[PDB]
DNA sequence: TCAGCGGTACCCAATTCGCCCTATAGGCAT
DNA sequence: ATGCCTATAGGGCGAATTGGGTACCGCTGA
C-alpha cells in the first residue's frame, strides 16, 4: 500500500543526477533530470523517507521542504569511488550492461547512495543485483549501438552512404538534410504529432514536385542566420537569403491550395517578410563578390553617399583615356600608355626609344628595362582622389553592411522560426517525394505493443540492391511477442530484423513506412546487439535489465561465445526471460536450431525461418520468411559463393560427414 | 598515516623490503581517488594476506581504514590472490605485490580538512619518491599522476652511470654543477655529489639531502659540517646544494669525517 | 623448358594495370605497376607468348618490341563487364575474396583477358578457379580489415584513442604524427632500412629528452612549405618557419655528439638555411598579424622605402593634437576634440551648445545628435597623406611578401628534404622516447618466416589497462607454423593474437618492439578478420596468404550451425598447415579444433588458462601448451552485468546439454 | 566550354581548461 | 612570544581544442 523509499541527488555545471532504493523489493534506479521543475516532480513522485544531498548542493530550495534529510560530504559523490564500489557490488568490470555507464551525473547520486546503503543497512542486500537508467524523458530511448549498427545516419566506416539518411536524404537544401538527421536521432512518439506529419506528408505527395525546385533556391538559410547573429555574415550568404525571400510569395500560393491544417499552420509559420526582401533587393548587387573586404557589395540607389564616393572612382578610366589620348597627340609618342600600379600608383609609360623624346612637364617616377615611367601634377592630384575615395566608399560599405544586421535582427527570431519551418518543409516534402516514388504506406498507432507489417521491406537494402527486396510481412503483439529466426547465412534474417527496426523508427518520424500496410503499437526502447563477446554480452544484459513489455528487442547471433553449450544456454535463458518474465517484444535472429524447441517450451514464442534453395555448390536465397525452422547448415554452400576454394569446400564436406555421422 | 605521501612512503618501502627492483607508483586526483603501488618483488600467500590487514603493522594501519585492494602472486607457481576493503578472491598479476588503494579518509570528516589542497599533496608524494629514488639506485621507479606518467627513475647497473636518474630527480640545473665525492677513513665510507659553490644559484639551493645506510635523517649536525665547508673555500656563505651517502659499521668524529671529504672535492 | 603464357595490359590517367594466364596450369593473376620501368620489368619477367592491348593504349613503346601482340577494342577493358563476367566465371557475388575488388586499373586487363580467354579457348576452364592481387611493395600488403582491427590509426568506434597511433603519437609536431601514421600503414620490409632506424633509435634513447622541446618549436613546417609553393603562405606560417630555422644550429650541435652514421646522415639532410634565417629575421616582425591584407608584417630596417611610407602614417597623432590644442585655444571651445572615423575619415567634433560658435574656416562633414563634426583644408590635406601612405606602404608589403617567395623557392626542394628529415627526427626521437619510456627491445630479422617473442606484450592494451599486461611468450617458425588459441572470453585469445600483429608491424617500422626480446623472420602480408562479410575476407586470406604471410584468423565459426563453421575452420587450418604452410594464428572457441595438432604437422595446441574460484573467476592471461578446459560465457555473463537467475538457467540448461557430452 | 558557385575539407587562432607560481598569509615546535 | 619555514589560493601563463575563416574542389546545369 505505502512504501519505505531511500534516495540521493547531486548536480554539476550541466544539470542534476538522481538515484533511489526500496529495501522491501531491492529496486535501484537512476535518472538525470536536466531542468529544475522536472527534478522537483521526480522527488515529489518517488517521495523518499530518507534523502541524501552533498554539503555544497547549489539549488537547496528543492530539498528544504522534504523529510528525513541527510547532509553528506562532497567526496562521497565522486565518480571514481562510485564506479569502483558499484562495479564490485554487482561484480562486473563495467556498468555498461546496466545502460548507465555514460550517466556520471546520476552515478554521483547512486555512488553516494550505495556507500550510504552499505552503511545504513549493513544487512543481506543480494536482492540488490542491478541498477537501471529511467530517463526523465521517455519520448524515445535509443542506444548509440543502434545508430552505429542500423546505420540510420552513419555507416560502419563513419560516412553517410547506404544509410537510412542517404535514402531519405534526397533533400534539396542542407538544413533539410540535418533536420531529417535529428528526427531520425529523436523519433517523436506523441501520437498527435506523428499523425500531424502523416496528414502533412499525404497532402504534399502530389504537390511535392512543384515545391522542391523552389526549396533548392533557398540554400542553407539556417547557418546564414547563425552568422547574422554573430555579425560575421558574408555577401553571398545575404544573396542566398534574398534568393530565399523571393520564393516565399511562391510557396505561400502553392501550399494555400493543399488540404492539411498542419500544412496551413506551417505555411503561416513560413511567413513572407516581403519588407526584408525589399531592403536586400535595393541594398545589395544581384551577385556580389565572396567577401565584403574588397567592396562591390551594396548596389547604387540604396545610399546616395556610397554613389558619391563611387562617382570619384567611376570618373577614373575616362579621365586617364583623355590624358593618354591628348598626351599621345601632343608629344607624338604612340607607345605612350597611362596605367595603374598598386606599389607606385598611376603612371605614364613610354617605349625606351621614345622615352627621352617626352616633354619637360614629365617627372621620373619609375625607370624600367624596356621603358621610362613618369608622373605629372594632374595625375598625382587625380591619384589622391581615387586611392582615398576607394577606401572611404569601401569603409562606408563595411559600416552599411554591419548596419543591415541592426535592420534584420529585430526579425532574427521570426527568421529562425521561418528557416526551421522551410527546413521542415524540405524534410516533409522530401519524405512526401519518397512515399510517392516508392508507394510507402501510412502506419497507424494502436494501444498495446505490436507491429503488423503486410509485405514490408528494408527501406535502405531495397534501394541499393539490383533485385527488388523480397518484402516480407510481420505479426508482433503481446501474444506473438518473440520470433526465433533461424536459416542460412545471407538467409536475410539480420535484414528482416533490421528492416523491422527501421520500419518502427521511420513510423516514429511520422514518415510513410516501407511496406504495403503497417499497424504498430507503443515501442519506447529500441535495443540492438552488435557482433564483435565482452562487447556482445554487455549490451544483451543492458537490454535484459532495461527492456520492458513495450520495448523492441533486436537480438543478432546471441551465441558468438566460447562454445555451442555456453552460447545456447545463455540464449536459451534470454529467450525464456523475455517470454516468461519480461514478456517483451523480441526478434531473436540466431543459428541455434536447438532453440527451435522453445515455441513448444514457452508461451509467446513462435518458430520462423528464411527459405533458401541450394543446388550443387551454388545456393540461391528465397529471402522469404516462412513459419518453421532451418533445414540444416548452409555455410558450406555459402563458402564457395564467397570465393572460398573448392579444396576447402571439399575438405569442409569431407569433415562435415565425419561430424554429421555422429548427429 | 595522516598525509597521503605517508601512505605512499610506507607502501613504497613495503616493496623495497620485499626485494623490489621495479616500483609502479600511481595516483589520481592528487592522491585523493587513487594510491596504487605495484612491484616485481616477492609475492604473499592467500594465508598471510587475510590476518596481515584484519609490514603487517603498516598494511593493517591502512587496510580496514581504507578501501585497500591488496593483490600478489608468489614467485612459486600459484594464482594471483586479491583482497578488498576482508575478502579474498583471485586476480591475475605478475610476480610481486600490488596495492591499488583509494583514500584512507572514510569515516573521518576532520581528516578531509587536514588535506592540504592537492597537487601540492602529490608534490609531497613526489618528494617521498624523489628521496627514496636517491636512497635506492638499484630499484626502477615510474611515478604517474591522473594516469599521466610524470617521472621515470630507471635502475642504473651496479657501478654504472648514476647521473641521468640523479638528474631526473634533481633536474638539469644540479646535474651540470654536480661534483662527485669519494672519502674513506677505516670503517667510514662517504660517497655522493656537491654543486660547485662558485656557480650555485637560487634554484640549486632547493636540494639539501643526506642519506645514511638507506634511511634519510634531517639532522642539524650535518648542516654545520656542510656550511662550515661552504664558508671555508670561498667567502660567500649562501644556501648549499648536495646529495651525499655515508656507510658506517652498525658522532663528532663523523662530523669531522664529513667536513674534510667536501673541501678537498670542491678545489 | 618454357611454357605458353597469355597476358593483357591497360592504363588510365593514374598508372597501369596488368593480368596473365597459363592454359596448362590455370594460374590467373593481377597487378598495378604505377611507373614505366616496373611495368617493363613485369612484361620482361612473365614473358607472355600472347599479349593484349586496347586500341588507344598511350605508352605503346613498352609493347612494340614484344611478340604475339593482339590489338583489342576499348569497351572489352571496361570495368562494368569485367566485374560482371569474372563474378559469374568464379560464381561469386563479389571479387572481395580475391583481394582485387578495389584494383579496377588491373581488372580492366583481367576483364579483357577473360573475355579473350572465353573467345580464344571457347571450352570449360574450371582450372581458372581464382585471381589474386600482388602489390608486392617493400611495404607490407595489409587489407583494411587489419588497419580497422589492430586500430593503427582508428579504433572500432572511429576515434584515434586506444590506437597504436595514440600510444606512439607523443610526437611534438603534427608532421611527425603523420609520418609516424604513414610508416604504420606502409611498414618497411627492406631489412637494411629497418636496421638503419633501429641503430638511429638506440643512439637517441639517451638524447631523446633534450631534442624533443627543440622539435616542438618547429610546428608543421611541411604544410607551410606546401602553401609557400602555392604562393598563398600567411605571415604566422613564415613566423613558425623562422622559429624553426633558429633551432637548426641547436639540433646540428646536439646530434653531432651522437654515435650513429644514419643520425649523422639525417643531420646533413636536415642541413642549415641560416641564410634564409637571416632574411626572415630582418624581413618580418617577431609576431605579425594573421593576414598580409592588414599589413604590420615586414619589420623596419629591411626596406628603406617601407619605413618612408610608414613615417608618413606615424606623423599622425602629434599633428592632430597640436591642431586640437591650437583650435581649442583660438575658438575658445574646450569640447573641441579631433578624432578618426573609418567611414568619414578624420574630423573636428564640438558640443551642440558650442557647435555654431565655431569659425568660418570649418566645413560641415557630419551632423550628430549631440554635436556637429567639421572638416578643414589642413586636416583634409593631412587626411590625403595618411590614407594614401597607408595603402602604398601596405601595397609595398604585399609585393615584398610575394618577392620573399622568389627568394625562398630556390631552396624549396632543400626545405622539403629538411622538413621531411625534421618530421622523421620527431618520429624517430618520439619512438626513441617511447622505447626508453615503455622498455621496448630491438627485434633482429632472420631468413625464414617466424616470430620468437620473450615475455612480449600488447603495445596499446598494456598502456590503457589499469593492471599490468601478463607477458606472453611466442615461438612461430615453419616447424611451429600454426597455434590453436582456444580459451575463455577475457582469456586473451584476441589480445595475444593482435599483440603479435602489432609486434610484427612495430618491428617493421624499425621501432623498438613491445617485448623483452624478439627475433622475427620475413612477414610480407598481414591479413586480419573480425565480425562486422565473414567468408568474403577469410577467402581473400586463403588465396593471397603465402609461406611467409602472417594470418590472424579470429573466431572463424560465427556460422549457420555448429557443423558448417567447425568443418570450415578445420579445413582452413589443414589448408594453411598442409598446403600453404603460412605463419597462422587461429584464435577460436572451437575446442573441437584441438584435435588438429594430432591430425596435422606444424599445428600446436595453446590456450589462455583460466582458474575459476568461488562464483567468480581469474584469467591467468598466460599462454599454456594445451586446450580450453570448459565453456566460460557463463562466468563472463555475470561480469557483463546479466542477472544471475538466467546465469542459473544457463547452468541448469548447461548440465542438461553437458550430460550428453 | 564555362563562370560562377556552393560546398567541403582543413588549417588556424582566439577561447577554454588545466598547470604553475609567487606574494600572503599562517604555523608550530621552541 | 616568535621567527623562520611552509603550504595556499587566486592570478598568470601555457597547452589543448573546436568553432570560424579560408583556400581549394569539383561541378552543375547553362
Ligand atoms: N529480403 C532480401 N532480399 C534480397 N536480398 C536480401 C534480403 N535480405 C538479405 N539480403 C541480402 O543478404 C545478404 C546478407 O544477408 P544477412 O541477413 O546479413 O545474412 P545472415 O543470414 O543474416 N548472416 P550474416 O551475414 O552473418 O548477418 C546481403 O547481400 C543482402 O543484400
Ligand atoms: N595478457 C593480458 N594481460 C592483461 N589483460 C589482458 C590480457 N589479455 C586479455 N586481457 C584483457 O582481457 C579483456 C578482453 O580480452 P580479449 O582476449 O580481447 O577477449 P577474448 O578472450 O577473445 N573474448 P572477446 O571479448 O569476445 O574478444 C580486456 O580487459 C583485456 O585488457
Q: b/e per residue, B34-54, with b = 16+ CB within 10 A?
A: bbbbbbbbbbbebeebeebbe
CA C93 to chain centre: 31
Using the mean position of ligand 1's atoms as its centre, give its distance from the Cα of residue C625 in Å. 40
What is the rounded CA–CA span in Å between residue C469 and residue C456? 9
Q: Which chain C residues are Cβ-neighbours of A489 within 8 angstroms? A: 534-535, 559-560
Residue A607 to residues A487, A528, A572, A597, A621: CA-CA distances in angstroms?
Answer: 11, 20, 14, 9, 19
Q: How far is the CA of A445 from the C1' of E22 (A)?
A: 50
Distance CA(C565)–CA(A488), nearest Å, equals 12
B92 touches chain C (CB under 8 A): yes
The dihedral sign for the CA sequence C533, C538, C540, C541? positive
CA A342/CA C517 separation, integer angstroms: 68
> Measuring CA to CA, how many Å separate A663 from each of A559, A566, A629, A659?
20, 19, 17, 7
Say if CB A494 and CB A421 are below 8 A apart: no
Q: Please, which positions of strand D sit below 7 A from a protein CB?
A: 4-8, 10-14, 19-21
Pair B38, B142: CB distance under 8 Å: no
Q: Which strands make up the sheet holding C5-11, listed edge to edge?
A: C28-31, C16-22, C5-11, C50-54, C69-72
C-beta separation of C613 from A539 below 8 A? no
Alpha-carbon gap, residue B92 to B78, rounded angstroms: 10
Are B176 and B212 in contact by the 8 Å Cβ rule? The answer is: no
Contacts of B20 (CB under 8 A, 6+ apart): B39, B40, B41, B96, B139
Please return the burial class of A413, using the count of CB atoms within 10 Å of its CB with bins 0-12, 13-18 and 19+. Answer: exposed
Which residues does residue B245 pair with via DSSP β-bridges, in sequence order?
B191, B211
CA distance A392 to A390: 6
Q: Are strands A618-627 and C472-475 parallel, antiparallel or unpaired?
A: unpaired
Q: Which residues pair with A613 in a beta bridge?
A: A620
Task: Determine the distance in angstroms separating the CA of A649 from the nearest CA of chain C, rounded to an integer.
Answer: 7
Looking at the complex, does the CB of residue A129 fall below 8 Å from at least one CB of chain C?
yes
Q: What is the gyration radius of the CA atoms in chain C, in angstroms? A: 36
For residue B222, give how far its alpha carbon lies from the nearest alpha carbon of chain A (Å). 43
> Which residues lie below 8 Å from residue C505, measured CB to CB, with a gap of 6+?
C140, C150, C152, C164, C184, C187, C526
Q: Which three cell numbers stand for residue C211?
A: 631534442
- Which residues on adjacent β-strands are paired with residue C276? none
Region for residue A473 given its phi and psi (left: phi exceeds 0; alpha: psi -120 to 50; beta: otherwise): beta
Distance CA A556, CA A451 (A): 19
CA distance C463 to B149: 10
Rounded to 10 deg, the angle between the C274-283 and C377-408 helix axes is 170
Residue B84 touches chain A, beta carbons under 8 Å: yes
For C292, counting Cβ atoms within 10 Å of its Cβ (0-12 exposed, 13-18 middle, 19+ buried), the class is buried
Q: Which of C29, C98, C144 is nearest to A642 (CA)?
A: C98
Nearest Cα to A156, choosing from A531, A651, A543, A432?
A: A531
Angle at A165 between CA A428 and CA A267, to 5 degrees: 15
Strand partners, C610: C619
Give A573 Cα–ligand 1 centroid separation in angstroms: 27
Per the CB < 8 A criterion, the answer to whether C289 and C235 are in contact is yes
Protein residue with least CA distance to atom 1, ligand 1: A470
Q: Which residues does chain B have within 8 Å of residue A78's beta carbon, measured at their own beta carbons?
A: 29, 32-33
Question: How many C-beta neighbours within 10 Å does residue B206 have?
Answer: 12
Left if phi > 0, otherwise alpha if psi is -120 to 50, otherwise beta: which for B190? beta
Q: Give the three-state DSSP class for A216.
A: helix
φ/ψ (deg, to 5) at C454: -115, 110
Minimal CA separation from B188 to chain C, in Å: 35
- DSSP β-ladder status, B89-90 and A472-475: unpaired
Residues in chain B within 8 Å Cβ distance of A75: 32, 103, 105, 112
The Cα–Cα gap between A619 and A161 comes to 29
Q: How many CB atoms lie within 10 A of CB C155?
A: 15
Q: Is C231 exposed, middle or buried (0-12, 13-18, 19+ CB in 10 A)?
A: exposed
Whole-angstrom Cα distance, residue C532 to residue A90?
A: 30
DSSP A442: -
Q: How far apart are CA B50 and CA B44, in angstroms?
A: 10
- By CB atoms closer than 10 A (0-12, 13-18, 19+), residue C152 is buried
Task: Provide, for chain C, the percentages of residues in helix, strand and coil under a 3-state DSSP scheme, each rounded to the nearest 5.
Answer: 50, 15, 35
End-to-end CA distance of chain B: 44
Q: What is the dihedral of CA A118, A123, A127, A128, to 10 degrees?
A: 0
Q: Which helix (H) or strand (E) holds C36?
A: helix C36-46
DSSP code for A299: P
Give the count of beta carbons closer than 10 Å to the beta carbon of residue B138: 11
Beta bridge partners of C28: C21
Cell triple for residue B170?
634533481
Q: Are C491 and C449 in contact (CB under 8 A)?
A: no
With beta carbons less than 8 A apart as the criterion, state whether C479 and C601 touch: no
Q: Which of B26, B32, B66 to mutate to test the interface with A (most CBs of A within 10 A)?
A: B32
Please tell me what resolution, in angstroms, this structure has: 4.7
CA C475, distance to chain mean position in Å, is 30
Q: Of A78, A105, A100, whose CA–CA distance to A11 is shortest?
A: A105
CA-to-C1' distance for C234 and E24, Å? 16
H helix runs in C508-600, sequence order: 534-544, 562-578, 596-599
- Which of chain B's residues 106-135 bind strand E, using a 7 Å CB cutoff? 116-117, 120, 124
Say how far apart CA A631 and CA B61 lie, in whole Å: 67
For domain B171-266, say whether CATH 3.30.230.10 is its number.
yes
Taking each helix axis from N to C end, the angle separating A377-408 and A274-283, rounded to the nearest 10 degrees, works out to 170
What is the C-alpha separation between A596 and A629, in angstroms, rounded? 7
Handedness of CA C350, C356, C360, C365 (dihedral sign): positive
- Match 542500423 to its residue by C-alpha cell: A150
Helices C221-229, C174-185: crossing angle, 10 deg rounding = 100
Beta strands in A32-100 (DSSP E): 50-54, 69-72
Q: Are B134 and B165 in contact (CB under 8 A)?
A: no
Which residues in window 258-317 of C are less than 7 A from strand E by Cβ?
Answer: 291
For cell 557647435, the residue is: C355
Which residues from the 140-179 window of protein chain B have CB within 7 angstroms of nucleic acid chain D? 146, 148
Separation CA A433–CA A209 (nearest Å): 8
- The answer regarding whether domain B4-153 maps to CATH 3.30.565.10 reads yes
Residue minimizing CA distance to atom 9 of ligand 2: C492
CB C561 within 8 A of CB A633: yes
Give the largest CA-CA distance in chain C. 118
Residue nearest to nucleotide E7 (CA to C1'): B116
Pairing of strands B148-153, B140-145: antiparallel
Q: For the beta carbon of residue B253, count every other beta carbon within 10 angstroms.
A: 9
Torsions phi, psi of A70, nearest 5? -135, 115
Whether A288 sits with its Cβ under 7 A from any strand D atom: the answer reads: no
Looking from the CA of residue C467, the nearest atom of ligand 2 is 4
Residue ranges of alpha helices (H) inside A362-490 are 377-408, 412-438, 461-464
Cell numbers found for residue C559? 556460422
Question: Residue C209 half-sphere exposure, CB side, CA atoms within 13 Å?
Answer: 11
Q: Which three cell numbers stand for residue A186?
A: 529523436
CA distance linking residue C237 with residue C239, whole number of Å: 5
Contact of A295 with A396, CB cutoff 8 Å: no
User: Which spans in A451-547 are helix H?
Assistant: 461-464, 493-507, 536-546
Q: How far is CA B177 from CA A260, B172, B174, B241, C206, in A?
A: 88, 9, 5, 9, 20
Tell me the HSE value of A532 on the side-chain side, using a 13 A CA sphere: 16
How was this model experimentally determined? cryo-EM
Residues in chain B: 267
How remote is the CA of residue C465 from the centroid of ligand 2, in Å? 10
CA-CA distance, B204 to C543, in Å (whole number)?
67
- B124 touches B4 (CB < 8 A): yes
Residues after which chain B has a gap (C–N > 2.5 Å): 54, 85, 250
Q: Are C448 and C529 in contact (CB under 8 A)?
A: no
Q: Which residues contact C366 (CB under 8 A, 6 or more apart)?
A: C341, C344, C347, C372, C373
Task: Answer yes or no: is A158 a known binding residue.
Answer: no
- Sequential DSSP letters for A558-575: TT-SSSTTHHHHHHHHHH
Q: Report, in angstroms and rounded to the nearest whole number, the Rg of chain B calculated over CA atoms.
A: 21
Strand E at less than 7 A from CB of C13: no
The CA distance from A597 to A603, in Å, is 12
Neighbours of C311 (CB within 10 A): 12
Residue C246, C-beta contacts closer than 8 angstroms, at least 6 positions apart: C217, C277
Strands A451-456, A472-475: pairing is antiparallel
CA dihedral A643, A647, A651, A652 (to 10 degrees): 10
Instruction: Provide the b/e sequence for C2-15 (b: ≥16 CB within 10 Å).
Output: eeebbbbbbbeeee
Sheet holding B89-90, edge to edge: B89-90, B81-82, B70-73, B96-101, B34-39, B22-28, B140-145, B148-153
Q: How far apart are CA C84 and CA C273, in angstroms?
A: 57
Residue C630, phi then psi, degrees to nearest 5 = -155, -175
State the cell numbers at C614.
568461488
Å from the C135 CA to the E17 C1':
39
Ligand nearest to the CA of C608: 2
Query: Stated in angstroms, how far is C275 CA from E25 C1'?
Result: 37
Q: Where are the domains of chain B?
A: 4-153, 171-266
CA B13 to chain CA centroid, nearest Å:
8
| Domains parsed from chain A with CATH numbers | 5-137 (3.30.420.110), 147-287+408-438 (1.10.1420.10), 311-404 (1.10.1420.10), 444-632 (3.40.50.300)
Phi and psi torsions of C373, nearest 5° = -90, 145
β-strand partners of C444: C519
Q: How far apart are CA C539 and CA B31, in angstroms?
A: 53
Q: How far apart (Å, rounded) are the C-alpha atoms in residues C599 and C593?
A: 10
Pairing label, strands A451-456, A517-520: antiparallel
Distance CA C553, CA C522 (A): 19
| Helix (H) / strand (E) containing A180 | helix A174-185
Long-range contacts, A496-499 (Cβ 8 Å, 24+): A496/A458, A496/A472, A496/A589, A496/A610, A496/A625, A497/A554, A497/A556, A497/A587, A497/A589, A498/A149, A498/A150, A498/A458, A498/A554, A499/A456, A499/A457, A499/A458, A499/A459, A499/A461, A499/A469, A499/A472
Tell me whether residue C253 is exposed, middle or buried, using C-beta atoms within 10 angstroms of its C-beta: 0 to 12, 13 to 18, 19 or more.
exposed
**What are the grid coordinates assigned to C449, written together?**
618466416
Task: List the 21-80 stretch of C: residues with Cβ below 8 A of A.
Answer: none
Amino acid at each position: 500500500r505505502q512504501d519505505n523509499l531511500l534516495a540521493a541527488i547531486w548536480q554539476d555545471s550541466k544539470g542534476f543526477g538522481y538515484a533511489t532504493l526500496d529495501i522491501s523489493s531491492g529496486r535501484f534506479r537512476l535518472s538525470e533530470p536536466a531542468d529544475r521543475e522536472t527534478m522537483a516532480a521526480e522527488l515529489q513522485r518517488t517521495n523518499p523517507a530518507e534523502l541524501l544531498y552533498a554539503e555544497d548542493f547549489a539549488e537547496m530550495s528543492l530539498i528544504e521542504g522534504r523529510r528525513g534529510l541527510r547532509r553528506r560530504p562532497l567526496w562521497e559523490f565522486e565518480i571514481d569511488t562510485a564506479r569502483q564500489q558499484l562495479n564490485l557490488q554487482f561484480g562486473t568490470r563495467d556498468l555498461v550492461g546496466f545502460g548507465v555507464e555514460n550517466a556520471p551525473r546520476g552515478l554521483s547520486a547512486a555512488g553516494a547512495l550505495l556507500q550510504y546503503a552499505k552503511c545504513t543497512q549493513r544487512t543481506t542486500l543480494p536482492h540488490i543485483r542491478s541498477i537501471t537508467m529511467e530517463r526523465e524523458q521517455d519520448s524515445i530511448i535509443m542506444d548509440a549501438a543502434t545508430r552505429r549498427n542500423l546505420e540510420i545516419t552513419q555507416n560502419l566506416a563513419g560516412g553517410a552512404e547506404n544509410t537510412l539518411a542517404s535514402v531519405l536524404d534526397s533533400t534539396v537544401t542542407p538544413m533539410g538534410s540535418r533536420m531529417l538527421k535529428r528526427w531520425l536521432h529523436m523519433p517523436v512518439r506523441d501520437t498527435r504529432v506523428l499523425l500531424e506529419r502523416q496528414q502533412t506528408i499525404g497532402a504534399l505527395q502530389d504537390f511535392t514536385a512543384g515545391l522542391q525546385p523552389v526549396l533548392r533556391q533557398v540554400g542553407d538559410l539556417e547557418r546564414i542566420l547563425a552568422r547574422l547573429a554573430l555579425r560575421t555574415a558574408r555577401p553571398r550568404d545575404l544573396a542566398r537569403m534574398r534568393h530565399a525571400f523571393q520564393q516565399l510569395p511562391e510557396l505561400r500560393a502553392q501550399l494555400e491550395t493543399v488540404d492539411s491544417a498542419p500544412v496551413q499552420a506551417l505555411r503561416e509559420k513560413m511567413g513572407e517578410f516581403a519588407e526584408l526582401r525589399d531592403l536586400l533587393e535595393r541594398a545589395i548587387i544581384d551577385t556580389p563578390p565572396v567577401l565584403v573586404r574588397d567592396g562591390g557589395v551594396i548596389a547604387s540607389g540604396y545610399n546616395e553617399e556610397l554613389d558619391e564616393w563611387r562617382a570619384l572612382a567611376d570618373g577614373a578610366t575616362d579621365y586617364l583615356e583623355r590624358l593618354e589620348v591628348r598626351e599621345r597627340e601632343r608629344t607624338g609618342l604612340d607607345t605612350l600608355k597611362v596605367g595603374f600600379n598598386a606599389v607606385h600608383g598611376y603612371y605614364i609609360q613610354i617605349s625606351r626609344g621614345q622615352s627621352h623624346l617626352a616633354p619637360i612637364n614629365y617627372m621620373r617616377r619609375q625607370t624600367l628595362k624596356n621603358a621610362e615611367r613618369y608622373i605629372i601634377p594632374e595625375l598625382k592630384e587625380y591619384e589622391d582622389k581615387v586611392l582615398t575615395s576607394k577606401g572611404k566608399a569601401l569603409a562606408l560599405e563595411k559600416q552599411l553592411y554591419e548596419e543591415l544586421f541592426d535592420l534584420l535582427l529585430p526579425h532574427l527570431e521570426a527568421l529562425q522560426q521561418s528557416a526551421s519551418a522551410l527546413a521542415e518543409l524540405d524534410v516533409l516534402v522530401n519524405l512526401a517525394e519518397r512515399a510517392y516514388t516508392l508507394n510507402y504506406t501510412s502506419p497507424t498507432f494502436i494501444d498495446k505493443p505490436g507491429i503488423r507489417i503486410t509485405e514490408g521491406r528494408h527501406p535502405v537494402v531495397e534501394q541499393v540492391l539490383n533485385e527488388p527486396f523480397i518484402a516480407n510481412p510481420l505479426n508482433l503483439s503481446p501474444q506473438r511477442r518473440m520470433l526465433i529466426i533461424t536459416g542460412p547465412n545471407m538467409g536475410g534474417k539480420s535484414t528482416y530484423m533490421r528492416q523491422t527496426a527501421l520500419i518502427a523508427l521511420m513510423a516514429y518520424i511520422g514518415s510513410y513506412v516501407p511496406a504495403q500496410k503497417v499497424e504498430i503499437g507503443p515501442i519506447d526502447r529500441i535495443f540492438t546487439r552488435v557482433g564483435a563477446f565482452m562487447v556482445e554480452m554487455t549490451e544483451t544484459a543492458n537490454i535484459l535489465h532495461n527492456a520492458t513489455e513495450y520495448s523492441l528487442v533486436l537480438m543478432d547471433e546471441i551465441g558468438r561465445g566460447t562454445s555451442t553449450y555456453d552460447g545456447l544456454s545463455l540464449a536459451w535463458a534470454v529467450a525464456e526471460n523475455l517470454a516468461n518474465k519480461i514478456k517483451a517484444l523480441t526478434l531473436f535472429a540466431t543459428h541455434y536450431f536447438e532453440l527451435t524447441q522453445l515455441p513448444e517450451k514457452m508461451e509467446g514464442v513462435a518458430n520462423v525461418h528464411l527459405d533458401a534453395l541450394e543446388h550443387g555448390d551454388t545456393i540461391a536465397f528465397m529471402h522469404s520468411v516462412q513459419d518453421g525452422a532451418a533445414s540444416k547448415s548452409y555455410g558450406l554452400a555459402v563458402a564457395a559463393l564467397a570465393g572460398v576454394p573448392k579444396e576447402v569446400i571439399k575438405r569442409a564436406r569431407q569433415k562435415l560427414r565425419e561430424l554429421e555421422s555422429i548427429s | 598515516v595522516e598525509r597521503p605521501a605517508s601512505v605512499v612512503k610506507e607502501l613504497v618501502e613495503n616493496s623495497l623490503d620485499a626485494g623490489a627492483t621495479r616500483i609502479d607508483i600511481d595516483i589520481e586526483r592528487g592522491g585523493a581517488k587513487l594510491i596504487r603501488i605495484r612491484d616485481n618483488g616477492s609475492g604473499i600467500k592467500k594465508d598471510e594476506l587475510a590476518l596481515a590487514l584484519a609490514r603487517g603493522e603498516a598494511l593493517a594501519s591502512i587496510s580496514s581504514v581504507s578501501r585497500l585492494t591488496l593483490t600478489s602472486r608468489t614467485a612459486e607457481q600459484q594464482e594471483a590472490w586479491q583482497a578488498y576493503a576482508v575478502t579474498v578472491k583471485p586476480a591475475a598479476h605478475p610476480v610481486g605485490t600490488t596495492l591499488e588503494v583509494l583514500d584512507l579518509f572514510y569515516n573521518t570528516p576532520a581528516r578531509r580538512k587536514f588535506l592540504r589542497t592537492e597537487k601540492t599533496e602529490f608534490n609531497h608524494i613526489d618528494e617521498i619518491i624523489r628521496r627514496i629514488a636517491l636512497a635506492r639506485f638499484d630499484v626502477t621507479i615510474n611515478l604517474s599522476h591522473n594516469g599521466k606518467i610524470v617521472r621515470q627513475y630507471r635502475a642504473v647497473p651496479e657501478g654504472g652511470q648514476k647521473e641521468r636518474r640523479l638528474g631526473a630527480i634533481l633536474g638539469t640545473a644540479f646535474l651540470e654543477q654536480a661534483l662527485a665525492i669519494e672519502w674513506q677513513h677505516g670503517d667510514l665510507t662517504l660517497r655522493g655529489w656537491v654543486a660547485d659553490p662558485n656557480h650555485t644559484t637560487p634554484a640549486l639551493a632547493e636540494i639539501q639531502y643526506f642519506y645514511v645506510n638507506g634511511r634519510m635523517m634531517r639532522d642539524r649536525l650535518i648542516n654545520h659540517a656542510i656550511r662550515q665547508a661552504y664558508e671555508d673555500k670561498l667567502g660567500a656563505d649562501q644556501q648549499p646544494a648536495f646529495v651525499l651517502y655515508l656507510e658506517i659499521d652498525p658522532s663528532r668524529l663523523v662530523h669531522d669525517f664529513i667536513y674534510q671529504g667536501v673541501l678537498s672535492v670542491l678545489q
